[PDB]
């Protein structure tokens, strides 16, 4: 569970920081403290994980699943590899 | 012109980024059809010229 | 060589678009299911009180 940056659903697609949880082969995001969560990808066993070497954006990954995709961006090269490996173990569940 | 892959956040809050993207995708659709339909009469004309 | 390399790429693109649009149809589905909301959306202030953009 931890902080990540993502892109908004506004017409400019502006970047924004939210707190994300990986649990029970699912990825959810928290929308306020002490309030119900929203699902980001329905399942992780049906995801692939993009390490994005040709992107302009720095420390970013992309998680692409059958019903839903999400671009995300972390604060360090450590955190990229640790969020990419957590999804990658999750994809093997 | 507008940004690619227009996602649902902007759509449902009636943003000006949405408001301008919808302005510009319709104007792109009028240019596109006209150029396709020109490319269509010109590819018609090409076969007629070949034949 | 270009006819092949454009072609191999277009068939990965179509399978990639199929999947991206599958993923987009299911998320499209989801918003309408239970979380779309009926209240007016809120004007978003930025650039503090001295630019105060709203």
How far is the CA of C23 from the CAs of A21, A25, C18, C43, in angstroms?
Answer: 20, 17, 8, 30
- The CATH number given to whatever domain includes residue A87 is 2.30.29.30
Query: In which domain, by residue range, is A91 found?
Result: 1-93
Q: Which two tokens stand for residue B16?
A: 């000006």
d(CA A62, CA C21): 16
d(CA B16, CA B7): 14
| Partners of residue A8 in chain B, C-beta under 8 Å | 9-10
Sole residue written with tokens 């970047």: A15
Q: Which two tokens stand for residue C16?
A: 């990639």
First to last CA, chain B: 41
Domains in chain A, number: 1
A38 and chain B in contact, CB less than 8 A: no
Interface test with A, best of B15, B20, B21, B23 (most A CBs within 10 A): B15
CA atoms within 13 A on the CB side of C10: 6
Is-contact C54 C45, C-beta < 8 A?
A: yes
How far is the CA of C46 from the CAs of A68, B9, B16, C49, C50, in angstroms?
Answer: 30, 18, 15, 8, 10
The method of structure determination was cryo-EM
Strand partners, A4: A18
d(CA A23, CA A71): 19
Please give the full DSSP string across A5-63, using - where no structure is assigned. EEE-SSTT--EEEEEEEEETTEEEEESSTTS--EEEES-STTEEEE--SS-SSSSEEEE
Sole residue written with tokens 């590819």: B43
First to last CA, chain C: 54
């Amino acid at each position: 569970e931890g902080h990540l940056f993502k892109r908004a659903s506004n017409a400019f697609k502006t970047w924004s920081r939210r707190w994300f949880t990986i649990q029970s082969n699912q990825l959810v995001y928290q929308k306020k403290y002490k309030d119900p969560v929203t699902v980001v990808v329905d399942d992780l066993r049906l995801c692939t994980v993009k390490l994005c070497p040709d992107s302009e954006r720095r420390f970013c990954f992309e998680v692409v699943s059958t019903s839903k995709s999400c671009l995300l961006q972390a604060d360090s090269e450590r955190l990229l590899q640790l969020w990419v490996s957590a999804v990658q173990s999750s994809i093997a569940s | 012109s507008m940004t690619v892959k227009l996602d649902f956040e902007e759509c449902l809050k009636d943003s000006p980024r949405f408001r301008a993207s919808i302005e510009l995708v319709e104007a792109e659709v009028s240019e596109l059809e006209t150029r396709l339909e020109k490319l269509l009469k010109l590819g018609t004309g090409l076969l007629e010229s070949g034949r | 060589q270009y006819r092949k390399e454009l072609g191999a790429q277009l068939h990965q693109l179509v399978l990639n678009s199929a999947r991206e649009k599958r993923d987009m149809e299911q998320r499209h589905v989801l918003l309408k299911q239970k979380e779309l909301g009926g209240e007016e959306p809120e004007p978003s202030l930025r650039e503090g009180p001295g630019g105060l953009v709203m």
